[PDB]
Symmetry: D2
Subunit: 363 residues, 4 copies
């Protein structure tokens, strides 16, 4: 082959520094990049009207939490709208985040689209004008981008086409980001839907990650200047078998060790519909695995850090401090979990809200 370096030693350093700040020991990411529609769903759930001020207010609640959260929050992913909003104090949101020590992030993909000739499989769009948008994003304080691709497990899925196409689009996305001084989060999300077991998800996860990394190589991506946002290796939600958190940990860590080169700065896990406490325990178990993990493994949770806070809010202005507190709490818990210092680990008799698929009711 022949080389024509995409980045200079100076470009690589900036990307590497940013990537390292976000996942520094004890820190994770707050995913509060819910689209106007997604957020509308949540706000509706807690009986609050999906209004402009309301959205700007709920984001304030999170980004304006007391200094207690600072060493826990390394990065915050915002939606295009939020990025251009102001706080009560006047300060534009990206500033509030930076003053507290966090790196500003922005979701740039434009949704998933169906791939013809498959069984409900998709790919993601958003590459058009990405360079210009990323250029403008870096200008407006943003440093890391988010892009979501989704894969499904089934009898004939994920197919080779979905694996190939999704891997390629991720590499294209990452390439443009790196050119604009923006560290790209690679997010090949494998859906926990179905009744497949643990090994299956682990096999599929390994296959997927393998393709992903080879594509990044083809597109000449500076891996140090990237972060991996994968799904935890877990059994399907409908799976009848039960698994210990330590099994989940072992599955996940092993899968990553067989595919993710040590050059990748970090792995920020998705909650994948797990409960707040469950997400912590699993994360802690992961960091507690006796296997050599050369990358940082932390969190990139949305609902798993907001659930209780959203409820505590309920759209009530007076519940401000109280709701923020629930978030500060989830914050600390996860700061300890990414360090394997989060005590809550050995618990199951009253920790899993999925015993229905274990009961005779599933047979």
């Amino acid at each position: 082959p022949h080389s024509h370096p995409a980045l200079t030693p100076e470009q690589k350093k900036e990307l590497s520094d940013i990537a390292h700040r976000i996942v520094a020991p004890g820190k994770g990411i707050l995913a509060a990049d819910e689209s106007t529609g997604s957020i509308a769903k949540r706000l509706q759930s807690i009986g609050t009207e999906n209004t402009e001020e309301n959205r700007r207010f709920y984001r304030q609640l999170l980004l304006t939490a007391d200094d207690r959260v600072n060493p826990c929050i390394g990065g915050v992913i915002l939606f295009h709208e939020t990025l251009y909003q102001k706080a009560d104090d006047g300060r534009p949101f990206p500033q509030v985040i930076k003053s507290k020590g966090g790196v500003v992030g922005i979701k740039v993909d434009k949704g998933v689209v169906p791939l013809a000739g498959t069984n409900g499989e998709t790919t993601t769009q958003g590459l058009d004008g990405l360079s210009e948008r990323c250029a403008q994003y870096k200008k407006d304080g943003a440093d890391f981008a988010k892009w979501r691709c989704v894969l499904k497990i089934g009898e004939h899925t994920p197919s080779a086409l979905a694996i190939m196409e999704n891997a390629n689009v991720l590499a294209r996305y990452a390439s443009i980001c790196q050119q604009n001084g923006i560290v790209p989060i690679v997010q090949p999300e494998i859906l926990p839907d179905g009744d497949h077991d643990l090994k299956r998800c682990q096999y599929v996860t390994e296959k997927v990650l393998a393709a992903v990394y080879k594509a990044l190589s083809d597109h000449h991506i500076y891996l140090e200047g990237t972060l991996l946002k994968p799904n935890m290796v877990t059994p399907g939600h409908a799976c009848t078998q039960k698994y210990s958190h330590e099994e989940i940990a072992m599955a996940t860590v092993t899968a990553l060790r067989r595919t993710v080169p040590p050059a990748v700065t970090g792995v920020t896990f998705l909650s994948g519909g797990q409960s707040e406490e469950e997400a912590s325990i699993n994360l802690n178990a992961i960091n507690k695995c006796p296997l050599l993990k050369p990358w940082a493994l932390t969190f990139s949770y949305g609902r798993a850090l907001q659930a209780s806070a959203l409820k505590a809010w309920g759209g009530k202005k007076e519940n401000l401090k109280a709701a923020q507190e629930e978030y500060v709490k989830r914050a600390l818990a996860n700061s300890l979990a990414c360090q394997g210092k989060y005590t809550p680990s050995g618990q199951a008799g009253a920790a899993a809200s999925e015993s229905l698929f274990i009961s005779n009711h599933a047979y």
Copy 2:
């Protein structure tokens, strides 16, 4: 594998019918899809200002060609602007085209962007919202589309990356079109730049087309519902070895036979910076090549069809008829070219001219 019907019998018939209609014996394609920036160039070089009206009247000037052109033009590629323009008679352009018996085409790509880490190589964007766009274009009279990818020959180009990426993006575009009833014209354009010889161009052409058709296969593309708009196999514009028309025909056809499968309805050739006459002589030669050609070998020219017409016009509404006459003659000339029934009134056709590269000034 396992089948998952990308299209129904009905959908396939429509694509095939449209496709076949475009390249019927004696018919070619007029490429009038120059974007605002490219059309400016033309009007600028002749001497008329880049006015919207000047562009509408100009394009009218082509599409209003008397019935003589009817059996010649099977399709016309339009740019978005032109699509919603009306002729002086009040009738919208797509309808005018149709009343003459031609099929309306629409360019859908958004230009080429750079592939980081390459030697000036690019890919093409346009996929975002392309599905909804095609559906709108179809309701509006468009039955086929055009997407231009470009590849270059150089000491280290085209590389594996550019080849894979361009063929992949093309397959994507082809899938989105076929879903919406629009026949996709696949354009893997290899530039004639450089001092490379005929054999080099033939070689890379073969490696490009091969990757392309493997790509269409993976994406489950309906070949019968597509068309290939490639470059003729010729030597580089700065090459020293002079070749006969027969030599370029034989090289072109052999490369196609080695890569393009029989199911592809037709091959619409690009001019490639060739003079109006050169294009007709070459095309004619390819059709006169003794080798078996199972697909249509016709044209999809732009400059080769409107060079003189544009000139004759000179922006003056009074130059109208003569300008139009130039076009008809190039339409007729080529109509016979794609049938191997054409002959320039020379002896062994028109000769070759000022090629400083095939002279003492190239050493």
Copy 3:
């Protein structure tokens, strides 16, 4: 990519000449390259002993069928052993084939081996020292070779690995043959085993063929100096669905039209467990198909040419002429069929049962 001529003009011409001779109009291939274990089975079924002497006689009988066979046989695929045996007059078997106007071929693969981590899939060995074997084989009268690869349709097969691998091994084999002056017959054989219907077989046939030609292109294979020996697109042997011959014909032609480039000199179909009649009938139908077929569509039958001749001989030298006329009959019949001239023969004792049950009735 970057060229590096694998063959000189003369080498290409040699290969092309040979390939074209084998598939001249009205001609096909006699596949009599049964391995020691294969011919043993057929011999034992009729009670005849499996000795080199018995084999030499059986092969002798076929190889010297009356001159009426000359125009029907373009080539004969022999097993190693036979290439070195002589006819009763002391003349080397290949020379007996050459004398009759036929081309000599040799089996070169070393059989299929299990693929790990698959559902009983395989690949084919035989590469080691193949270039040396081919140089010698060429010296000894062989002009074309045969390499068999087996793919099986199942709920999840052929897998991406089996397809990729089998295509790669074929391309390596072909390359070696072409470097030693021998025409390689690409045999991507999909088994009729299973209860999959026609549609399923066509889809699988199309996916596998695309991969094959991409690999051949990747390994710089000269298509004109190759022959493709595939399966006709038919329903699985266990399929309950009844299909007419015209459907079988349309499916097979459609699949080839969509994947086999026109530069391929010819397609030599194998019988695939069909009866002698079925083989002639389906191939005739194939040559009747109203679609454009740029390549010679012929036969490469083993059982479809011998089954009846084997029942005439029955191990007794007395039945020499009886056996020979049977095969002469089947050759003449397929010669018509490969030209779409075969008149399907009426009830001739068969049409209830063919020849090889195992035997006829013994207690």
Copy 4:
């Protein structure tokens, strides 16, 4: 996709155990697997005529080294012949190796052959019947195997065909080995020949290694049951720029971190023409590199351990005592280097006993 366990957890256990035993901290591999041809070269140099007895005695000299080498040698690669030879005490070589705590390895490839249509590139053969040989080798005491694949850097090398094919063959060999309980050493050898600089060598290695691991994944290879035998990152033997061992180590470690998954048990570097001292200094530099290294970084030296021992021997039995001491010292010197605890007694000594390899008069 869908899994089909190529190995049972127990087989996986055994493979993992072997791989770990080989590269235990402070241990490395002695590559004494020279073919009859290669060794004859070394013997000629010391006026020793290549004979069955001489070879057997030189191997015995090396293998009978005093017990200090035991904690240095985790394994020894042998050639077929040697596996069945016995030391003067009546016990077969494999038994002795094991007596000294070492694991026995065998070279299984059948050498390289040229790839058609490339700039003199090659691929490796040796797969035919490999499983049977593996079953035999295991029976006789071999626990791991060696397969050499050669890659060359130049103006247009390695080519995609060369990367693709070699990576694929390596994977096929690995699959076969693991099925027989033999730990396969993946050896994608990039030649130091040429005048390319450090940057190019590092860039090429990364691309090759990425391709290799993608192939291993595709073929379902158990990484924990394999080892990697790569070249160190160094400029070509014809390069004129001066590089320090620190730059060498940095380039080397970096490339590995970017491509080799943490699951790979160990990495055994090969001599690469380097002098004995150069090898130890470089291996040590590598271990002293401040970058995170998840896998064991050791050696698999042949000439970098035998050089002075052969010379010392000089074909004189008296020099037996002498020769053995030279070996033990290099081994002890490398046991330390693979632990980053080695130090040169001032200068080195390369140009004095050889003048180096590449291109003095190269064959």
